[model samples]
Target: EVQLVQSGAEVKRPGESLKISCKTSGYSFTSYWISWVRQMPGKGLEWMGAIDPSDSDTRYSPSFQGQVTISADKSISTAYLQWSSLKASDSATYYCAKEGIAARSLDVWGRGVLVTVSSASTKGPSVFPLAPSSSESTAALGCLVKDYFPEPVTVSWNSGSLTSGVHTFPAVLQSSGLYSLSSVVTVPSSSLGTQTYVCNVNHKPSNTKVDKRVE
Candidate 1:
């Protein structure tokens, strides 16, 4: 009986490491090369890469290049995908496939393994207005969003991803395994009409909004 069985689901935190396994049987493992594909949430399939068990030759897609490692072992008739450092973006379902025995024939695919890289104890972000260094009330008001878990966060400076004087920093990861993101925007010193400036944060898979009321 030919069978391609994959490992169970995985739940990991950002910056954590992981490895998924796919075991094959009922045929010569080396003759038929195996491949891996990804399916993001509500998205279509994406080819990760492929590996030949016979010679250990591997090829990766441009998107997955250097992002993940693919390998196969004929001794155990298995293929694996390993990650040294995981990101929230790594959460998705991955499937293992084998090349067809005949040209243009249907390939063999295993039941995908669900890999989620989210914190079980998710935390939202808090906004803080940075102090003014000079006399420019009408200028850039730096907003800081900090202490959030799992990095799928966004900031709305009103310019929110609007890309003006906006400068969104990368999320900072601390020893505690949480992250902090700081996004800022500066207006021309000449444009000073004085309006309300608020720091806004949209984070998590919950689609919740958190804000800091500022002038």
Candidate 2:
């Protein structure tokens, strides 16, 4: 009986450090544990770790204990995942879920936090069309950018694009510091095969492109 929402999206490079936030709205943060999940590109979801806000006690997937860190603050009802060293393989969609009372399922989940890792220049166009139908109106698109090396990055939709009937929402940053940003855009239901979404990174040295399709 809780509704937990995540902070937003994130963009980072390999070897750089990054931390993303997750916040809960319905339940008491001190009474439950927050968990982190990872979904690699074209891969299934992986349970990264969990943390109890009240005592700061943590649990992590055996495969991820040394790879990531999970922390929390009960006062703000927020939790976080941090990485001291990142790799290209780490690029994927990351999410925060609430550990179920039964301790078996992901009862609550945030939208997603995507990170990109690479050494060379990443290339591609950053524009995609938004088309949705009445039955599929619940889908939303967002982009997260983390400015570690360069100045803060900008997240915005392509101007003059066609607007679908689905509600469009503003991208907002929910976490306190750590210096990251997110932008979200909503559209109606869309046919999986015909729709494509893109996240554009405005890194000064070069820009990277990540494209995804709704299934």
Candidate 3:
């Protein structure tokens, strides 16, 4: 199993800058994706986005698309999240979650990185290195068929499994009498930081179901 070790706590004012670090040790950091999640003092979990440490491929949630910068340093097996400005609204605690090799749910989660905002100092841009998950290699398989009476189906991952993962790709029906499909999954960075991953697909009638697992 992989693991994620985060940095220390940070205290900054409404206009002060701060940053935290999430380091991985026990897996191939590049093989998996690292994601950042936001947790208010007493709010729900918010998905920021994910960064491919290997090639620096970043996929951001539409809400946070341009809000923060997600980058990685493969040499040190570390991932970073940056903010250009500080706001009182950003005073909540933040944590870095790793995505599974299959790119599914957030199986592993890191302890919250407490970032307190006060009146002592002005807040500034902060950089934090989020945790990464295990490094199990995952693969996707399926085909797109025309949606006829039975609606041509494809295969991908599904939720509701344990220790395993899920898949959420996109597909479209084109005018060329063909179905276009893309396999996409987003797991917690911490999950990949410390475990094995599995993503499988099985064909079915009108609907092609997917299977995912990680241990």
Q: Give the winner by lDDT.
A: 1
lDDT of 3 by residue, 54-125 (tens): 788999999888867888888888787777666666756777877875774575667768775544322111
Candidate 1 weakest lDDT stretch, 10 residues? 188-197
- lDDT by residue (100-179, candidate 1, tens digit) is 86622338889899987865556777678874564654466676777777657877765453457677788876656577
lDDT comparison, 2 vs 3, better candidate: 2
Instruction: Quote each prediction's TM-score.
Output: 0.55, 0.56, 0.52
Q: In candidate 2, which residue pairs get closer than 3 Å at backbone N, Cα or C atoms, i.e. clash?
A: 9-144, 132-188, 132-189, 133-189, 136-189
Q: How many steric clashes between backbone atoms does each model show? A: 0, 5, 35
Candidate 3 Cα errors over 4 Å, as ranges: 120-215
Alpha-carbon RMSD, each predicted model:
9.8, 13.7, 22.9
Each prediction's whole-model lDDT (CA) = 0.78, 0.63, 0.58
Per-residue accuracy of model 2 over 1-215 as CA lDDT, tens digit each: 67666766666767999888887878777877787888986799888888877788888888988788898877778888889999868977888888777664678888887775545333322333343433454576655454333223443344325344323333232232223444456654453346554444344434543332333
Off by over 4 Å in 1: 101-106, 120-215
How far out, in Å, is residue 67 in model 2? 1.8
Error of 2 at 167 (Å): 27
